[PDB]
Amino acid sequence: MENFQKVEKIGEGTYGVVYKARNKLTGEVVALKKIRTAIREISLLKELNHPNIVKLLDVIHTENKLYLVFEFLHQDLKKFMDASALTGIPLPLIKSYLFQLLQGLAFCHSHRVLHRDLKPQNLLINTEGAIKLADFGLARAFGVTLWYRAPEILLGCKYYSTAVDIWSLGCIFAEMVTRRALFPGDSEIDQLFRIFRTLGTPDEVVWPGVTSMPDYKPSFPKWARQDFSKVVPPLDEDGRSLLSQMLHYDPNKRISAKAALAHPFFQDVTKPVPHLRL
Numbered sequence: 217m218e219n220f221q222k223v224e225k226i227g228e229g230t231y232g233v234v235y236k237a238r239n240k241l242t243g244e245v246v247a248l249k250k251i252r253t254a255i256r257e258i259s260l261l262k263e264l265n266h267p268n269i270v271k272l273l274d275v276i277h278t279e280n281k282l283y284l285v286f287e288f289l290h291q292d293l294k295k296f297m298d299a300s301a302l303t304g305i306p307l308p309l310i311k312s313y314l315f316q317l318l319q320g321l322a323f324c325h326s327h328r329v330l331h332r333d334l335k336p337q338n339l340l341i342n343t344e345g346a347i348k349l350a351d352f353g354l355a356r357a358f359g360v361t362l363w364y365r366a367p368e369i370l371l372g373c374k375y376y377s378t379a380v381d382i383w384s385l386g387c388i389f390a391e392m393v394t395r396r397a398l399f400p401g402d403s404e405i406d407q408l409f410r411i412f413r414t415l416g417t418p419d420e421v422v423w424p425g426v427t428s429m430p431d432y433k434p435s436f437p438k439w440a441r442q443d444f445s446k447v448v449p450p451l452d453e454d455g456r457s458l459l460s461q462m463l464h465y466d467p468n469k470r471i472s473a474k475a476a477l478a479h480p481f482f483q484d485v486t487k488p489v490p491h492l493r494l
């Protein structure tokens with residue numbers, strides 16, 4: 217830690233406190249995360265290299281405490297969404313952000329790395345219009361907002377697939393468009409029933425095997441499904457189609473990141489500049 221200076225606290229991440237730090241030998245400004253089997257597997261994440269993934273620079277194990285050194289970005293998507301809530305993020309920028317996030321997820325999924333806990337606070341942005349995913353692979357290597365959790369997680373499935381990340385990103389997409397969280401649960405059951413009240417209570421027809429899930433209860437409220445045009449207005453039918461595919465209940469059938477990239481919603485994608493106030 218004497219290898220850094222002006223070490224300054226940004227705030228709480230998922231696994232510990234994130235600091236902004238300046239490296240001694242290089243003058244590099246980095247993000248240093250102090251975390252409250254895992255060493256080798258986190259170390260392997262130093263090999264991931266993609267424009268839409270926050271680079272993991274170094275892993276430091278000292279005094280039985282783990283420090284992860286990452287590339288530094290200046291803002292998260294939560295802050296940007298809050299700053300933009302008056303006016304809304306323009307559609308072309310939502311589109312660009314979604315496209316980029318999908319490309320990051322396509323890459324990680326193709327290397328068998330899941331996120332498992334995507335949320336606007338782990339999506340980081342810069343002045344050039346890039347958005348990047350922070351924390352891939354940490355949940356598996358290591359072994360609180362529920363708002364983005366997939367229904368198979370809430371129903372107690374033990375085996376996690378890449379579909380959980382698509383669900384979370386769909387929730388984020390909806391939130392960028394409406395300005396409000398899609399399923400802001402206050403408890404695990406409230407999270408599940410908010411999903412249920414919007415998308416309808418799942419059944420064997422739309423989700424084979426759901427009623428044998430660990431936490432499934434045959435006494436679960438039987439709500440009808442609502443229309444997407446009620447859920448994410450005034451999003452156009454391309455965007456509503458893609459979101460419907462990202463929020464399919466059956467994880468085997470939820471759209472993949474690769475397939476989502478091909479959706480007609482992205483035919484006119486561009487890369488706008490955000491106006492960031494730093």
Ligand SMILES: CCn1cnc2c(Nc3cccc(Cl)c3)nc(N[C@@H]3CCCC[C@@H]3N)nc21
Nearest residue numbers: 226227228247286287288289290291292295337
């Ligand atoms: C470890 C990867 N990593 C790289 N750059 C960051 C980073 N930059 C940042 C700097 C100023 C304001 C904001 Cl909003 C974010 N912030 C976080 N995490 C924060 C945890 C506290 C709340 C804000 C952020 N979510 N991690 C970063």
